[PDB]
Amino acid sequence: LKAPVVVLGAGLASVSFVAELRQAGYQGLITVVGDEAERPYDRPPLSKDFMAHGDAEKIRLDCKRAPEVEWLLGVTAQSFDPQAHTVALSDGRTLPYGTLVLATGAAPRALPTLQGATMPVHTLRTLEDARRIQAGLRPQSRLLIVGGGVIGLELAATARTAGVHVSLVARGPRLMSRAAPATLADFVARYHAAQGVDLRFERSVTGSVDGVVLLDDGTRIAADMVVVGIGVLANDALARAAGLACDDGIFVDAYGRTTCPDVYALGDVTRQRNPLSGRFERIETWSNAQNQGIAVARHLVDPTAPGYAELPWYWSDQGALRIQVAGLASGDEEIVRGEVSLDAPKFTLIELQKGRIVGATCVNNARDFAPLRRLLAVGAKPDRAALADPATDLRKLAA
Amino acid sequence: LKAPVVVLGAGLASVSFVAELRQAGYQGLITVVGDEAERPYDRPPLSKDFMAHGDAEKIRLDCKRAPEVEWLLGVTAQSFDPQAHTVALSDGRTLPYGTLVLATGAAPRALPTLQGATMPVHTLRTLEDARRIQAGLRPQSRLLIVGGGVIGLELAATARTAGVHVSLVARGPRLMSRAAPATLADFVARYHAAQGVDLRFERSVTGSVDGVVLLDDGTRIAADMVVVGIGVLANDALARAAGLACDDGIFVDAYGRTTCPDVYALGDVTRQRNPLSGRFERIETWSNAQNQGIAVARHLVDPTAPGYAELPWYWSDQGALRIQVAGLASGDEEIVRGEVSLDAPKFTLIELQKGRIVGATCVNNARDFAPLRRLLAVGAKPDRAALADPATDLRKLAA
Ligand SMILES: Cc1cc2nc3c(=O)[nH]c(=O)nc-3n(C[C@H](O)[C@H](O)[C@H](O)COP(=O)(O)OP(=O)(O)OC[C@H]3O[C@@H](n4cnc5c(N)ncnc54)[C@H](O)[C@@H]3O)c2cc1C
Ligand SMILES: Cc1cc2nc3c(=O)[nH]c(=O)nc-3n(C[C@H](O)[C@H](O)[C@H](O)COP(=O)(O)OP(=O)(O)OC[C@H]3O[C@@H](n4cnc5c(N)ncnc54)[C@H](O)[C@@H]3O)c2cc1C
């Protein structure tokens, strides 16, 4: 940890990192470069309460635990010179660094077939996106969502609640194909269909003509607006130009180190080891952004601290469904606690592999999620009869 | 480049690296730790001329361009401490380093279903392997090869030439599924079948009982020996224990840097960027081992030198077929020069993507391979009619 510290990106990973540096005792310079001209803010409400109620001051991140930080907002880092230890800024200035931290996140993938579209086509990543989408969302408007991931599904629910007609097109046979058990994905499709969402599976957008979208089955969908939610690409251009190892994401170890000396990376921009699968993955969760940022900062200030070691997990609020998912989506067995029903959904899934818990899902059952994450952390092998038995208290079992 | 240099592994990548360091002007200490008790040697003849003629002194690597290097042969590096800058050796000694280079290659994957086998089951990676296989290869013996990659196919040809009966089982629908155009793979299967190889596609080994192997179709194959050739796994255990980013291979950039300061890696043990596909891959070719080793050494001694930048290519000698393959296995078009026939095989394949050459194959046509690799290097977009026209001289076109 050499002063001064420069962080590129001012999202959740960056804020969490700089707050931890200060909390851990580092008092040297910290400068954060953020290309969006916005007080740092959290993204999950953009698909939900913000989309619905429109108050950005309710979604700002608290920078109080990060005192004495200069935030250069509305400024883009254009390049860095890892030999000179400098960063070049879009406003003409240069910053020196002892330690450089890349926390530039990821940007939505565009749909090549809609490139020359002449109807409103947005992605949903920023406050500016959400404001723009919000302003086109009249009741009885027709919204088409492309992609079956959680963001599109979160927006789908918010739109329906407002009285918007929603169609959703996904190229695969199921929703949430990334990091969700099949049982959950099937149920989530059932729920949204019952709420009026017109689901089209195994279809792709082939193009569009004057307010209508075309599909690979040769059919059409007309809509007042398309929101594309087909995943994101790491914002790793600076790393790539400077010679760091990247592949849709900057490779880092558990200390956040890149292959370039004195340059670290964290958050959505990184490809990192998933301790459960043992494979490198770009882990794009809110918990990762915060916890990896904290872990990397902690180890920078105190090198005796361990590397980042958390197992991955996320939540997704989709209307009446409060979904929580931890670990791997499947193993050699799934245990289902409770009934899987649209009549007051509440259930828990437990994925095991050779008797060890490797994943868990709670739907409207937050009480069980915390003890399951603890059991998951230690690779617990509880009695599967007890795990199934609804009499069993998961909290107590977690001892 | 801080002295002293320690290299772990004494295979082709290591030898090529240390020879380049010396050639480039570095005169400080170099110590190489090699777990095999063998004068450093080249592996390709093990499936061919060595298997057939048995003279290991014809396959030693020339260490002459690497003067003043201490080679610790028959010694295993057990761990390294990247803070202390030391390596712990199996013989009880410790080596200090300024710069550590991991060139530990890869080891054959074992077949879990043959774990408790009670018939001879070998892999083919080392001189010791080849000697052992050689000694069980009587004419009219029955050899079963598991896996359809090039090493097994090279051995298949060598065995047939000696009068051994050969069966080969591959779990997929084709041979050489890794980095070979389908047209080549189909032809290679045709050739080996015509030479007497009993090919079984889309079958897996489920186990074995008293001299007989069992398959997932419920059938049996009896053999005097099984040689397993189902791919390799990076020897990255030391890197993993020391906290480097690894995933069946140590991630490096074009300078050979790992995520750990003063530790580099090269050769079969690395996952690196393929400039043609733009993705990270473990590139397990002879040309990579030598050329990546040379590039990393060159840049260590002279930091103004460029990073490793070669496009991947390999050859495979399979009996009457002298196969050479460069670049990607497919694009949006394949041009075929010459006829694809078992009657004196000679042909060239050219893979293009948006008019640019992205890959090439020559079978018994080495004359065309060198100009194709040059065209491939610069992303040439030659007239496809000329590329097809056999009147065309590829060498001259390469201007
Ligand atoms: C609509 C929406 C809904 C979500 N809901 C959920 C959810 O239900 N659950 C969940 O787990 N997660 C959800 N997420 C939240 C999410 O996971 C976090 O926002 C994210 O993981 C934070 O990662 P980050 O800080 O690394 O990246 P980012 O938030 O993307 O921050 C990176 C910042 O760096 C900026 N930047 C990039 N390049 C440069 C440069 N050269 N110079 C300066 N600045 C640059 C970027 O523009 C960006 O502002 C949702 C996200 C969105 C968009
Ligand atoms: C049978 C066979 C046929 C082949 N034919 C072809 C071919 O037709 N074309 C082609 O392109 N390639 C072929 N290859 C050749 C090949 O590609 C090269 O051998 C390989 O790519 C060299 O890479 P390397 O130097 O990085 O690794 P290696 O050759 O594996 O060298 C690594 C060495 O490090 C040692 N080591 C590992 N861990 C430790 C430790 N902790 N301490 C000390 N030492 C350690 C290993 O045991 C090994 O000796 C063939 C290989 C084989 C085995």
Q: Are strands A30-34 and A70-73 parallel, antiparallel or unpaired?
A: parallel
In angstroms, the CA A145 to CA B328 distance is 35
Q: What is the torsional sign of CA B326, B331, B336, B342?
A: positive
Residue nearest to atom 29 of ligand 2 (CA): B11
The Cα A297–Cα A204 span in angstroms is: 42
Q: Which ligand is nearest to the CA of B290?
A: 2
Q: Name chain A contacts of B261, Cβ cutoff 8 Å.
A: 257, 261
Q: Residue B259: its chain A contacts at CB < 8 A?
A: 245, 251-253, 255, 257-259
Which chain A residues have any C-beta within 8 angstroms of a chain B C-beta? Answer: 243-245, 247, 251-255, 257-261, 272-273, 278-280, 307
Task: Give the residue among B87, B68, B86, B72 at the shortest CA–CA distance from B21.
Answer: B68
The span from the CA of B240 to the CA of B248, in Å, is 10
Rounded to the nearest whole angstrom, what is the distance from the C-alpha of residue B10 to the centroid of ligand 2?
Answer: 9
Torsion angle of alpha carbons A229, A235, A241, A245, nearest 10°? -100
Task: Report the half-sphere exposure of A288 (CA within 13 A, side-chain side).
Answer: 26
Segments making up each domain of chain A, as ranges? 1-105+234-312, 109-231, 313-399
**C-alpha dist (Å) from residue A161 to A53, A368, A373, B354:** 12, 28, 32, 46
Do A104 and A115 form a contact (C-beta atoms < 8 A)?
no
DSSP A162: H
The domains spanning A109-231 and A313-399 adopt the same CATH topology: no
Note the ligand closest to the C-alpha atom of B235. 2
Spatial separation of the C-alpha atoms in residues B246 and B268, rounded to whole Å:
13
In this structure, are strands B347-353 and B333-337 parallel, antiparallel, or unpaired? Answer: antiparallel
From chain B, the residues in CB contact with A307 under 8 A are 243
Please answer whether residues A189 and A220 qualify as being in contact, where contact means their C-beta atoms are separated by less than 8 angstroms.
no
With CB atoms and an 8 Å threshold, state whether A254 touches B243: yes
| CATH 3.40.50.720 assigned to A313-399 | no
Query: In what side-by-side order are the strands of the sheet with B121-123?
Result: B121-123, B225-228, B142-146, B165-169, B198-200
Q: What are the phi and psi torsion angles at B31 (to 5°)?
A: -125, 130
Instruction: Let me know: does B7 contact B99? Beta carbons within 8 Å.
Output: no
**Superfamily of segment(s) A1-105+234-312:** FAD/NAD(P)-binding domain (3.50.50.60)
**Determination technique for this entry:** X-ray
For residue A387, the one-letter residue type is: L
The tokens describing A323, both together, are: 């979904």
- Its sign, for the CA torsion A385, A387, A391, A397, is positive
Among the partner-chain residues A254, A259, A280, the one whose CB lies closest to the CB of B258 is A259
Q: Which ligand is nearest to the CA of A74?
A: 1
Distance from C-alpha of B278 to C-alpha of B311, rounded to nearest angstrom: 11
Residue A248 CA to ligand 1 center (angstroms) comes to 15
Label the pairing between strands B205-209 and B198-200. Answer: unpaired
Q: How close A245 comes to chain B (CA, Å)?
A: 5
- Could you tell which of B35, B178, B269 is best to mutate to test the pocket of ligand 2, judged by most ligand atoms within 8 Å of the CB? B35
**Phi, psi dihedral angles at B199 (to 5 degrees):** -85, 130
Ligand 1 pocket test: pick from A71, A155, A235, A264 the residue with the most ligand atoms within 8 Å of its Cβ: A235
Measured from the Cα of B75, ligand 2's closest atom is: 43
Q: In angstroms, what CA-CA distances link A57 with A19, A53, A154, B145?
A: 20, 11, 21, 67
Centroid of ligand 1 to alpha carbon of A31 (angstroms): 19
Upper half-sphere CA count for residue A337 (Cβ side, 13 Å): 25
Q: Do B247 and A307 touch (CB under 8 A)?
A: no
Q: What is the resolution of this structure in A?
A: 1.9
Q: Are B225 and B133 in contact (CB under 8 A)?
A: yes
Q: For strands B333-337 and A198-200, give the pairing.
A: unpaired
Ligand 1 pocket, A104 CB below 6 A?
yes
Pairwise CB contact (< 8 Å): A243 & B307: yes
Q: Is the CB of B260 less than 8 angstroms away from the CB of A253?
A: yes
What HEC string does A41-58 produce?
A: ECCHHHHCHHHHHCCHHH
A247 interaction partners in chain B (CB closer than 8 Å)? 273, 278-280
A46 lines ligand 1 (CB under 6 A): yes
Q: Could you say which DSSP state residue A246 is in?
A: B
Return the CATH number of the domain spanning residue range A109-231: 3.50.50.60
Report long-range pairs for B298-305 (Cβ below 8 Å, ≥24 apart). B298/B20, B298/B24, B299/B255, B299/B256, B300/B1, B300/B21, B300/B26, B300/B99, B300/B255, B300/B256, B300/B264, B301/B1, B301/B21, B301/B24, B301/B25, B301/B26, B302/B24
Q: Residue A203 in contact with residue A197, Cβ under 8 Å?
A: no
**Whether the Cβ atoms of residue B168 and residue B148 lie closer than 8 Å to each other:** yes
Distance from residue B126's CA to the centre of ligand 2 (Å): 8
CB of B289 shorter than 6 A to ligand 2: yes
